[PDB]
């Protein structure tokens, strides 16, 4: 039929002289005959005019050979969290000189940021199209009266777009090489992007080699997130419309079903935050996908080897110390033993029992409410398997969500998405889950064979420590373990263990 | 909602792409090479077809060989409601009529991007120039 894109919102009651008209449909009926237009010199062209043009109605379906597609699949959105940034814009209505289109007023991001803009819009004139201030008003309702003060204050689009580039740059420069705007109803937000997004074939950053994420109109050049300073436009963005996945009611509804922290003020950024929150829940709270792998953005390899070295020492030692008959490995989707050479019966449990070797894992979602009396025999292992209250007979490792890093991103409730290798949604650290446990003190244990300045320590439990044996081999191994242990402590991980754990059970293997 | 509309869902995609592009000219050309259909809904003139061959004229001046169009509608930058590359920035085709070879009048907008006007005779180089 006819589109809404570029709707002339002007209160003018005539047409646009065949010469000043941009389209056939915009020409005044006074020059239209038998399907064509005709130059009637007695009806002269307009010397001057100003017609507000609606920029609502963009459709970005293009499939052009060298150009990236702005909208992405749910798969890519997940593949590239980090890059996710929530985006919601509150507008205002065109009103005196024109009417029938919305202008950006408050731009909200899933950072805490709210940028207020001068209501500007696109005006077609007799010579060119001008980008200028447009008369506007906040939407009619009562819940929109908070936008009345914002019709004053605010600032120039000159600025607002630089601020956006800067804001995104700071947020994303150590996380991704792109940006993915996370949208609820993409219409108006895509319109707002016209005001600060340019697109084209992929490019790379001046100086750097990374992907260009920004563009300077000032001097036709491109930038990554680390060099984009003074750059005014976002260059190739990506975006995802969350509601299009398949949702019931409004944003407020679906979000609050899965979250009690992000309170909704009527302000733009809250809707942005909530939008992201919801998307995270539908991809990361809906349990872990181990086939999706994420790249190293920094110092992950050192944390992971520390985590395993410690995991091994602690579980190895507790099994020798208290001679448990059974080890209940809760939270292991694979069939991998952290102490593969132990005599104990090793049972595996998980909510996502990997299909490839499904037979070795009992499907289970642990709840204290349910299983508090079920795993009585032996010891339970919860190494980054975050539950409700933990059972007294347990060895536990839990990530403190409050620790900031490039790996720890915001998530549901009060928790977070720890994205090391693979993405792990971790529920907020709750002190009372460890009621039944003891915080695990530092120790080192080795029953291995033995071999500028040496050190003595009481925490080194080794056959060569009964008074002077800095045993060069196990001096090193101790000092390395010590570093690994401290790595993971300061990396945010917390260790707890059954109260009966006693290092004399370990010393006793040597006092004999 | 008010307003008196402007465009046809045909141009809706083509235009969104060039509006957002860094280089609209390049974008449009690439778009067409990628199989997209050229911008339509232009201002085509009912004309005697007896006028001077000149490209940019005050009133319609088509030949039997040409068609006459309402200049602004043949200008990519006017159709996208974006900035013009004229450093001063006033469109050279708005408020005038544009003469386009019937053989090339399939794509008015592209035709004006792709071609150039002779400063001496006022006719398109290659499409009606008597110099050289
Ligand atoms: Zn939330
Ligand atoms: Zn133009
Ligand atoms: Zn000539």
Author numbering:
A (entry chain A): 3 to 453, 465 to 525
B (entry chain M): 0 to 131
Q: Which text from the study accompanies this structure?
A:
To achieve accuracy, CoVs have acquired nsp14, a bifunctional enzyme able to methylate the viral RNA cap [methyltransferase (MTase)] and excise erroneous mutagenic nucleotides inserted by nsp12. Nsp14 is organized in two functional domains: the ExoN domain at its N terminus, which interacts with nsp10, and the N7-MTase domain at its C terminus. Moreover, since nsp14-ExoN belongs to the DEDD 3′-5′ exonuclease superfamily, which includes DNA proofreading enzymes, this activity was proposed to be involved in a CoV RNA proofreading mechanism.
We determined the crystal structure of the nsp10/nsp14 heterodimer by multiwavelength anomalous diffraction (MAD) using the anomalous scattering signal of zinc. The crystal belongs to the space group P212121, with cell dimensions a = 185.97 Å, b = 189.74 Å, c = 195.93 Å, and α = β = γ = 90°, and containing four heterodimers in the asymmetrical unit. Nsp14 is a modular protein composed of two functional domains, bordered on their N terminus by two other structural domains. These four regions are organized as follows: (i) a flexible N terminus forming the major part of contacts with nsp10 (cyan), followed by (ii) the exonuclease domain (orange), (iii) a flexible hinge region formed by a loop and three strands (gray), and (iv) a C terminus N7-MTase domain (pink). Here, the N terminus of nsp10 is stabilized by the first 25 residues of nsp14, forming a clamp that accommodates the first 10 residues of nsp10. In the presence of nsp10, residues of the ExoN active site are correctly positioned and form a highly active ExoN, as judged by the observed distance between catalytic residues. The ExoN and N7-MTase domains of nsp14 are separated by a hinge region that allows significant movements between both domains. Sequence analyses show that amino acids forming the flexible hinge are conserved across Coronavirinae, suggesting that they play a critical and functional role in regulation of the nsp14 hinge region movement. Indeed, this particular structure allows lateral and rotational movements of the C-terminal domain with respect to the N-terminal domain, such that an ∼13 Å deviation is observed from one peptide chain to the other (crystallography and SAXS analysis in Fig. S3). Between the tip of strand β21 and the bottom of helix α9, a third zinc-binding site is found. It is formed by residues Cys452, Cys477, Cys484, and His487.
